[PDB]
Design a protein around this ligand. Sequence first.
Ligand code: ZN
Ligand code: ZN
Ligand code: ZN
Ligand code: ZN
Lengths: 5, 5, 697, 697
Amino acid sequence: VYIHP
Amino acid sequence: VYIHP
Amino acid sequence: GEGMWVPQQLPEIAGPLKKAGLKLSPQQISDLTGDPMGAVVALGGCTASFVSPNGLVVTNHACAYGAIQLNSTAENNLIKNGFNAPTTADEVSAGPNARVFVLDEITDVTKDAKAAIAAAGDDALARTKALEAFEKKLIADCEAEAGFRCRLYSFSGGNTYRLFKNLEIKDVRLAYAPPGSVGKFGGDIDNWMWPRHTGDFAFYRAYVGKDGKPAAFSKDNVPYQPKHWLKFADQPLGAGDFVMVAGYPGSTNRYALAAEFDNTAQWTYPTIARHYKNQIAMVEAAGKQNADIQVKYAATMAGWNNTSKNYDGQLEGFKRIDAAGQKLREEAAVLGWLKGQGAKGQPALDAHAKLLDLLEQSKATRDRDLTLALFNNTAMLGSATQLYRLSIEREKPNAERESGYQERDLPAIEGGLKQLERRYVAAMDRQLQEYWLNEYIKLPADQRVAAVDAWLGGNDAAAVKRALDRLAGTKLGSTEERLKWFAADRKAFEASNDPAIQYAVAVMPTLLKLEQERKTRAGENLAARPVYLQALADYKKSQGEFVYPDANLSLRITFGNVMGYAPKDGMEYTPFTTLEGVVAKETGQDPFDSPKALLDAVAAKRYGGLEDKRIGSVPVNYLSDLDITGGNSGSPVLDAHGKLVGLAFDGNWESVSSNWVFDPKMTRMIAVDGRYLRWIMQEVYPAPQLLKEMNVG
Amino acid sequence: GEGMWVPQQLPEIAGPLKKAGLKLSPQQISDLTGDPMGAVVALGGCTASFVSPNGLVVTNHACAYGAIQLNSTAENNLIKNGFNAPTTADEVSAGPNARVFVLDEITDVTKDAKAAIAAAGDDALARTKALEAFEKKLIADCEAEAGFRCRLYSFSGGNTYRLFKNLEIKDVRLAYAPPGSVGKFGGDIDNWMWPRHTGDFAFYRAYVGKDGKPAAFSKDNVPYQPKHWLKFADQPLGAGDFVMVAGYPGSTNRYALAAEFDNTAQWTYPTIARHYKNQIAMVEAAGKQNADIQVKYAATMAGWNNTSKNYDGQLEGFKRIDAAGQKLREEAAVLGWLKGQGAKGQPALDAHAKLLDLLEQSKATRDRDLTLALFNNTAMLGSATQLYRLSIEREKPNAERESGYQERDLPAIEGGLKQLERRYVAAMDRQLQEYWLNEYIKLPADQRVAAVDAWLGGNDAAAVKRALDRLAGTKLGSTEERLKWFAADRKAFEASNDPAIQYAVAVMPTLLKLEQERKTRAGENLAARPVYLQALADYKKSQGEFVYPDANLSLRITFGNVMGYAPKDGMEYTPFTTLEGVVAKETGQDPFDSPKALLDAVAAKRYGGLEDKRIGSVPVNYLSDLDITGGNSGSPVLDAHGKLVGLAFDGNWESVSSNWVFDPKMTRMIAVDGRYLRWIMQEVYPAPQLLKEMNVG
Ligand SMILES: [Zn+2]
Ligand SMILES: [Zn+2]
Ligand SMILES: [Zn+2]
Ligand SMILES: [Zn+2]
């Protein structure tokens, strides 16, 4: 998923 | 492979 | 699409054939000894086709595997290296039992057959004996012309009988096989799967005497001159294009009682696959340590692996489509439908009751029957039982001898005993006897054989141990001892101290009685089956469903188009694979170890004039919605103009359960593209002379 | 296709946009506060958009996951059950740190920024401090207008600077979330994978004070009235159709030295992946036995899972395309090309050598630096160190306070201390402390920290236990105690007997020294980085390649078309998935346990007016060739007319290596179809109020 870590 | 049997 | 059409159904499929794209007239296709149907030949368990006027025959690597293995040793392994004969004089015998059958004539004999059956009235065993007697006489008459072999086929549960007459070519030679890393690329890992990248092809040549008549192997024989042979396509085959296959599918079980299904799914397939895997594991270990065992057992190993995986696949496919459920639910629907017509539908309903009872009967002894059958199929017990039984049958007039033991069967018997030399190692066979003795003792008391118990003298490691030690004393391990007993009389077998012969003599009465019990079961089936199956066909007709007989090793036509399938949502398999996909699976280790020449030619895009623009490479294998099954390997795939575009060789994983319940979305043929054949023979393992002979080099 | 294009590059993509099928004018897309671009908002690590005039905001479930989790308990678990506010008064706060940022203005400040840097002279640390001071002043000025938060961005290695001003909405509320088995269908098994069947959406509502101006949560607040909002497509999206995304991708490393790639692939990703998988294992095991741990750590666990799997996929994609070799050869080509330009190439060659030395300096202490940062990121040590550092910064004038510790950061700091209440269990944090202690102890002597070694007073399992037992005496476990310390002064920290505070006091001088080293290296990087990266840009352009900056959390546009991709020979992934593919994956066990209403509705073929006749079903997810990365989750996908056709949420497995080397053939966006959002909200977890508000019910 392209959430920002 | 469709050798019999 | 669905259907393994008999040639007598061509009027029914002529329109569908046109719609799918056939551009030959249905008339030209109805000529079974014409162009091109007359090029298509039976091998006995595979198909093949003539591809030159000098008797060149193409089939699969997997169909020729036997012939290849027979000709291999640990130090000259042809399976591994391939084979190429630069001149016809270099071609090697495919073996005494190898055959090419060229169709001569078909005759409907239905009325006669069921008259002879009816004339026994009402005794089950006698009914079987009467059909047997009728078949023998028919075949004896048909085979009066020297060089022909004939066969009686029962279609649709015994509603139709036809007699096939074939030219029996008995000198078959191997002309070419690609290395096994091409012929069987991907091995048992890619077997029954797509994406596939396997160059599954090989060539034979057919030989006859100098007088043109069939004859067994001799250097004085010359190539046969077929009346008809196939030509390679001149148009590139693509997605959506028309394809057809003509060939010899073996068996299907699409007309079956549900209980026949459940038995097969719950007992038959799991049991046989377990047994086959256990033997594979034994022979694999022994063969890692012993190259002689490895080459000698390679063909047996290919059969065990292929059938076991097929069964693993059918079981998985039953669960995917709930076959058990569909069977139940259509049986309900058919039985419901039958009573719904009172007097009319009463015979059919009786038949169902009968069949079901016969099934429970065969079920009562299934463990016994299978286990004894396989124990007796090990090399020395098989040889001794077969040879003893022959000595017994030889005492009767030839017409009363059991099928498989008449005069017309002597060549294949003697051939089998010679071929066994290349397929037997005593230390290996000992372990299989051991395996099957362990499985026998493991059986329940009601499931035992008195004669085998006594022969054994106990139920433990010790008895097994003594049995094995005893049997090791046989002389049947040599081809010459086997051929001696092939000629000996019954008295001589009964006088023998050979331990394997002693075993056969000990069990034969039991085997003959079991055989009588089967012939009697079959006799009742012969009454009930045709009625019930005619009803199933009638009901299918009433549902507008497709109606064609289960496969029975006779000539059938399937047609359709090149297309992939969708195994899961979000994906699709494409109809073709390509050269690049072969090299992508390269690991340098069996079974993904292509020849160097292949890897180099692919890296260099040497496409040899054979690239298809639409896929940007040379095609390797392709999917189509044809309806094939075991027996169809080697079948030529023809295009809209009857030209050769490939060879049938496999089905995709999800297809195999269609043996029982046909699924049109997941049922595809996997074929090797004629362009890949040509490509391998140009760039990888060259055979310039064969390409020239086929007018493509 | 490739490119995370800055708005200022619209002129250069106007042509390509039109050719791909955009029917809006480019000028219309140029207006970043107009229709539709002004609907697109940042969330701080995700993207979202307005979809109603009354402040309704749609994003991914993965983006709202923290908020959903903050409002969940073991007894009333909204991650599991979903949430739905039947009226706006039922909406729950998303948490004090939740934000919606609405773009107000962008300004180029490149000239001024670079003059501030130049004025520092030769010294690396002054150069960092000059840029910091520049940034703080600029931001202070920008933020003089109440309600606005500003951000300075560096692009292309310091070659361009722009300031963004955003309206900062500070009262964000949860309006709707589907159940977890929809929002995260397939869990971590399907994460980073196609085929994908995930309903990854949720809705917030943005609130402001009655005076129109941003405010923290209050029952007196009312919904924000956005200037622009998106509309749902009235045309069915199909394969090949144009799509574009605007959003906020976080970071890419496509401009990087070979050695920076090498270190990442060889050390950074495998190290982090291992540490994350180790912690996942402990927390998973504990949460199995304690439902309060399971719910409190769910958001952290989602992060660890998502990151570690992403890193695994990157490592695999590097091997698939030989990224190491690609980077080695590109760099040799740029260095050759520079050497070729004589004198005028020299400043970039020198920059390259300086960059490489700075990387080496970094590498010498990497294990220490990572291990200490992550030990200090457990909940109590993280709290203690952050709050002790704030008490130090509070004694300086605000303009001189470290960024993160200024007055403008106090809301976030405080909100984080409160949020942690729903994200901490002592017995879980202890195990995490223990993990990191054991990793610290495996560091070699030259990677150790005197302060931590002294505090530990030993190097074995006993000392570890004694330290954990000491830290367990902290009182920072409670929200009220953390807030006390949030306001306390430096002296109060240095007098404390709280053992976590004592740790912080003891290690703080060391953290401050490490920070100065990092600022020093950053200052050298300010000198070298823009010169080399400009050379890289110039070289790419001489090669005719696309030139756009790496992602840096600022607004970008990407565009392309709906299309699948080919992962290997003989197969293709189709652009869409469908409802029946969701059901096909059902197992009744997490993560494949869809809501019963979903399974019912699909079985009954209730498509709700949303069927796309071309796929035979309601579309669920789709692939396209857009160029997105972490931070794009939640971005609207627009069609040719600027209508909403989906939300961006993931990449396929093979795409993730594109962070370092872009592969056009295997790089796809995975988006959730607007129709599936609507279908879920009609048939499965109904929200008729929201559908009506969006004019689709
Ligand atoms: Zn034509
Ligand atoms: Zn002898
Ligand atoms: Zn239009
Ligand atoms: Zn206190």
